[PDB]
Amino acid sequence: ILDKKFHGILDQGEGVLIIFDEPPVDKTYEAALETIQNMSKVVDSLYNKAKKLT
Amino acid sequence: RPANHRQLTFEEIAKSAKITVNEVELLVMKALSVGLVKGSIDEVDKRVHMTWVQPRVLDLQQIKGMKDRLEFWCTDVKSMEMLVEHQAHDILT
Amino acid sequence: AVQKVVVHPLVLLSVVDHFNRIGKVGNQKRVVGVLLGSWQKKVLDVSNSFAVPFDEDDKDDSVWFLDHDYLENMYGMFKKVNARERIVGWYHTGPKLHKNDIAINELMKRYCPNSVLVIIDVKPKDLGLPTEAYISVEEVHDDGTPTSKTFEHVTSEIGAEEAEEVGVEHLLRDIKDTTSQRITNQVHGLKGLNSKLLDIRSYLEKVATGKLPINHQIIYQLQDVFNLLPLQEFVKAFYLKTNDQMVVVYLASLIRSVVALHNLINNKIANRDAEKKEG
Amino acid sequence: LLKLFTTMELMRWSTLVEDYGMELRKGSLESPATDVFGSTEEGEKRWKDLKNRVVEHNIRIMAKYYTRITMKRMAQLLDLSVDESEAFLSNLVVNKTIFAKVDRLAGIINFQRPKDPNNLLNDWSQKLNSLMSLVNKTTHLIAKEEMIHNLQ
């Protein structure tokens, strides 16, 4: 499981393992990371602003 | 019954349908072969679930008193159309 | 059997001008003429047709006048012009019907194996779509009497086979590419609602003075497709929609915050530029 | 057996054993029986693979009411025992030509379809196509109501 060879939950308190994995979310990953980059770009533009101001 | 609890228990079936618990499954798999009702019958609670059915032939008293669904639909989807449009009224624009 | 034909508004304008004709020549009321078409498939095209000089006596609607020199003869002159849009059917104005439509269409059935009559609209006031087509039908009854031929609603829609809006578009001078949703919403709502009002009044008539078609053949299965959701307890659909609106508000939030930042940055840039670098 | 080609005829296996053991009791054409159940190392093996037939084709046919079904009542509605059903689950599930999901955490699990892990797609299909059927309702409502109103 630690190396993605297996994806799910085992058990000893119940001795019953259960498998599960549904990672892919292009919405969240994609959009959120793009927004992170947008934040970096705005940080960049902040200095253009502070310059043209004074 | 128009109402919900469409995950009906087998109890009315086995009481009024003169059938047993071991034969409600055949009672609705033979109806799957018939093809007028195709329920997703529960079998952890043994509940005979109601899906879409072939309804009746005539209910002339309910052809008259379907107003509580038809005029219900008409004036209430009309009123809520007026309410959606009335909350988005002055973006008529 | 036809699901749609090309309802080309050129034949619409022909119909309209000949309705102006029947109105201005005198008092012949019901506009009736011959519909021409080319059967490509179940789908068809209606771009060319014509009105036939015909009269209907007040009583005995089975009164009609279809000159062979104004139809069969014209067909040959039109055959050298374009054989495609063959004799395909006819039409009548007047909202509901008269008694002759069936006999007329069956007389012309010899010309077109699937001949059509169309209740044509002379005054566009509808909620939706104008004139529709009705082909020969054999639909008698469970009784199955001698086959009635009251031509059923043979659905179709306004086919614009070609653009040709070089002038047509040049006529509108009113609209844009509506980037309108509210228009659609009010129309859809009020149309469903008035339709349902027609329904409830028709059924109150059925209970009161309606005929045996009170629940004729589908009105009960009409209520069954209503019985699609017969509060409907959409609780499964309730938490379904809960996750759906998780998605919806994720869209709204992320995208519109992007929009915020977007206008913010450069609009403020230009703002401050023209603001302080001007003085 | 030709009727068995629908609904699987989830029949008491001994009844079919009668229907196809009296073939050997034919005061008529019986060479069918000997070709089928006059054999031992394969004819009785034919009975065994017939058990295979009944169980696996019942798994096929009963795929509708699932997502709730118990290991015990499985056998109850299987015409075969529970640990018989255990071995049947085992073979059909390592064969896994279908994708079910099961666990003895409860034993109430089923020869399922993908168990509906899907997003709005379900809602999408439902809402869209249903609403479409409803516009179709309207568009023929006008028509057929007019038709029944023709005489009037």
UniProtKB/Swiss-Prot annotation, chain A:
Protein family according to the UniProt entry: Belongs to the proteasome subunit S9 family.
Post-translational modifications: Phosphorylated by AMPK.
Shown chain mapped onto the complete sequence: 369 to 422 of 422
Gene name in the database record: PSMD11
Function statement: Component of the 26S proteasome, a multiprotein complex involved in the ATP-dependent degradation of ubiquitinated proteins. This complex plays a key role in the maintenance of protein homeostasis by removing misfolded or damaged proteins, which could impair cellular functions, and by removing proteins whose functions are no longer required. Therefore, the proteasome participates in numerous cellular processes, including cell cycle progression, apoptosis, or DNA damage repair. In the complex, PSMD11 is required for proteasome assembly.
Record lineage: Eukaryota, Metazoa, Chordata, Craniata, Vertebrata
Subunit description: Component of the 19S proteasome regulatory particle complex. The 26S proteasome consists of a 20S core particle (CP) and two 19S regulatory subunits (RP). The regulatory particle is made of a lid composed of 9 subunits including PSMD11, a base containing 6 ATPases and few additional components.
Name of this chain's protein: 26S proteasome non-ATPase regulatory subunit 11
Annotated localization: Nucleus; Cytoplasm, Cytosol
Tissues expressing this chain: Highly expressed in embryonic stem cells (ESCs). Expression decreases as ESCs differentiate.
Induction: By FOXO4; expression in embryonic stem cells (ESCs) is mediated by FOXO4.
Swiss-Prot record, chain B:
Modification N6-acetyllysine occurs at: K15
Alphabetical keyword list: Acetylation, Proteasome
A GO term, aspect molecular function: structural molecule activity
GO terms of biological process kind: meiosis I; proteasome-mediated ubiquitin-dependent protein catabolic process; ubiquitin-dependent protein catabolic process
GO cellular component: cytosol; extracellular region; ficolin-1-rich granule lumen; membrane; nucleoplasm; nucleus; proteasome accessory complex; proteasome complex
Keyword Acetylation: yes
Family: Belongs to the proteasome subunit S11 family.
Subunit annotation: Component of the 19S proteasome regulatory particle complex. The 26S proteasome consists of a 20S core particle (CP) and two 19S regulatory subunits (RP). The regulatory particle is made of a lid composed of 9 subunits including PSMD13, a base containing 6 ATPases and few additional components.
Entry function: Component of the 26S proteasome, a multiprotein complex involved in the ATP-dependent degradation of ubiquitinated proteins. This complex plays a key role in the maintenance of protein homeostasis by removing misfolded or damaged proteins, which could impair cellular functions, and by removing proteins whose functions are no longer required. Therefore, the proteasome participates in numerous cellular processes, including cell cycle progression, apoptosis, or DNA damage repair.
Protein name: 26S proteasome non-ATPase regulatory subunit 13
Swiss-Prot record, chain C:
Role of this protein: Component of the 26S proteasome, a multiprotein complex involved in the ATP-dependent degradation of ubiquitinated proteins. This complex plays a key role in the maintenance of protein homeostasis by removing misfolded or damaged proteins, which could impair cellular functions, and by removing proteins whose functions are no longer required. Therefore, the proteasome participates in numerous cellular processes, including cell cycle progression, apoptosis, or DNA damage repair.
Official protein name in the record: 26S proteasome non-ATPase regulatory subunit 7
Organism: Homo sapiens (Human)
Taxonomic lineage of the native organism: Eukaryota, Metazoa, Chordata, Craniata, Vertebrata
Keywords for this protein: Acetylation, Isopeptide bond, Proteasome, Ubl conjugation
Gene Ontology BP annotations: proteasome-mediated ubiquitin-dependent protein catabolic process
Family assignment from sequence similarity: Belongs to the peptidase M67A family.
GO terms, molecular function: protein homodimerization activity
Per UniProt, location of the Glycyl lysine isopeptide (Lys-Gly) (interchain with G-Cter in ubiquitin) cross-link in this chain: K176
Swiss-Prot record, chain D:
Record PTM N6-acetyllysine, positions in chain: K64
Residue intervals of the PCI domain: 1-116
Source organism superkingdom: Eukaryota
Clinical condition linked: Stankiewicz-Isidor syndrome: A neurodevelopmental disorder characterized by delayed psychomotor development, intellectual disability, behavioral disorders, mild dysmorphism, ophthalmologic anomalies, feeding difficulties, deafness, and variable congenital malformations of the cardiac and/or urogenital systems.
Function: Component of the 26S proteasome, a multiprotein complex involved in the ATP-dependent degradation of ubiquitinated proteins. This complex plays a key role in the maintenance of protein homeostasis by removing misfolded or damaged proteins, which could impair cellular functions, and by removing proteins whose functions are no longer required. Therefore, the proteasome participates in numerous cellular processes, including cell cycle progression, apoptosis, or DNA damage repair.
Family: Belongs to the proteasome subunit p55 family.
Subunit description: Component of the 19S proteasome regulatory particle complex. The 26S proteasome consists of a 20S core particle (CP) and two 19S regulatory subunits (RP). The regulatory particle is made of a lid composed of 9 subunits including PSMD12, a base containing 6 ATPases and few additional components. Interacts with ERCC6.
Protein name as catalogued: 26S proteasome non-ATPase regulatory subunit 12
Organism from which the protein derives: Homo sapiens (Human)
